Design a protein around this ligand. Structure first.
Ligand SMILES: NCc1ccc(-c2ccco2)nc1
Length: 330
């Protein structure tokens, strides 16, 4: 089997991407944030505290003839950005782009933090990291990908995120028309439950490539590119007037600037992030100070190749017995 679904930016900044997902019988379609940095499929639901729902589409398990309460199971997750959610668990039929998994754990939110409530466009998350990170207790549950894997034509999924445009998540096949050149594969460590890999270095603009190992995670659920402070300083030093603002919470730059590109290495290959991808717009409405898309990971404990990086590439999440990542230009 295979599946193929379009993923759409939630706003004009590509702050996140939503992908329609069919849950239950008859289908209830929710727009989920596919997150290769976590491993829970959770949804706003008829069980979510009413005051914490503001415009989201909800899953109502009582209206699904295939929903079953997973007795005794609860979940609770906190994300790196400080947001969180928790609740109970159903199993139900879940389909993405024509690929169907029966008996998928669908984690129904009883509580969500304010940032989820405040984002009407995201109806939940679909985790695509390794199932070892799944938070369901007392019996940990598998991700959609892990459940689907054996049925897929090839045990892979691909992320092809658009810049200011829709893109595609494919399951079970590699669309050889979706990228240019070749896909360079690189080793993955699953020890922390992430798609963790080591970039071979970077360049800023037309500058020389610096060969240096940068260990980080491929995370579709993180907006920005978080890298070591040395790398980030080298980037922003090329932008007149850019500075790190403690009050704003990162590097800002004059909105009048034209940003340089940023290149990262994948083995001997190079992925170029155009400068425009690094502009996250005014820090507040009407400001001429703009927020940068490359930020320091210093306070995080891990480097994160988020959407800013991934959307410059066609990315293969190879879930073979020994997982690997592939990157191609596009
Ligand atoms: N990096 C995981 C992740 C994904 C989405 C969100 C999110 C959406 C709306 C508010 O917060 N937060 C964290």
């Amino acid at each position: 089997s295979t599946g193929s679904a379009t993923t759409t930016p939630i706003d004009s900044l590509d702050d996140a991407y939503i992908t329609p997902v069919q849950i239950g019988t008859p289908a209830q379609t929710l727009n989920l944030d596919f997150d290769t940095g976590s491993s829970d499929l959770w949804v706003f639901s008829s069980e979510t505290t009413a005051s914490e729902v503001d415009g989201q589409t909800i899953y109502t398990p009582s209206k699904s003839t295939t929903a079953k309460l997973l007795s005794g199971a609860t979940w609770s997750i906190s994300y790196g950005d400080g947001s969180s959610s928790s609740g109970d668990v159903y199993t139900d039929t879940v389909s993405v782009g024509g690929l169907t998994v029966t008996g998928q754990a669908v984690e129904s939110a009883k509580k969500v933090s304010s940032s989820f409530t405040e984002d009407s466009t995201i109806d939940g998350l679909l985790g695509l990291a390794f199932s070892t990170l799944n938070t369901v207790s007392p019996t940990q549950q598998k991700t959609f990908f892990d459940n689907a894997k054996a049925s897929l034509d090839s045990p892979v999924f691909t992320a092809d995120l658009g810049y200011h445009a829709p893109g595609t998540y494919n399951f079970g096949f590699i669309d050889t028309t979706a990228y240019t050149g070749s896909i360079t594969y690189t080793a993955v460590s699953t020890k922390q439950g992430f798609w963790e890999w080591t970039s071979t270095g970077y360049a800023v603009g037309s500058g020389t490539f610096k060969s240096t190992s940068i260990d980080g995670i491929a995370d579709t659920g993180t907006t920005l590119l978080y890298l070591p402070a040395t790398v980030v300083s080298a980037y922003w030093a090329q932008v007149s007037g850019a500075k790190s603002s403690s009050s704003v919470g990162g590097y800002v730059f004059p909105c009048s600037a034209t940003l340089p590109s940023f290149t990262f290495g994948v083995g001997s290959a190079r992925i170029v992030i155009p400068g425009d991808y690094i502009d996250f717009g005014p820090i507040s409405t009407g400001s001429s100070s703009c927020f940068g898309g490359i930020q320091s990971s210093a306070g995080i404990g891990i480097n994160i190749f988020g959407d800013v990086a991934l959307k410059a590439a066609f990315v293969v999440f190879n879930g073979a017995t020994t997982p690997t990542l592939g990157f191609a230009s596009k």
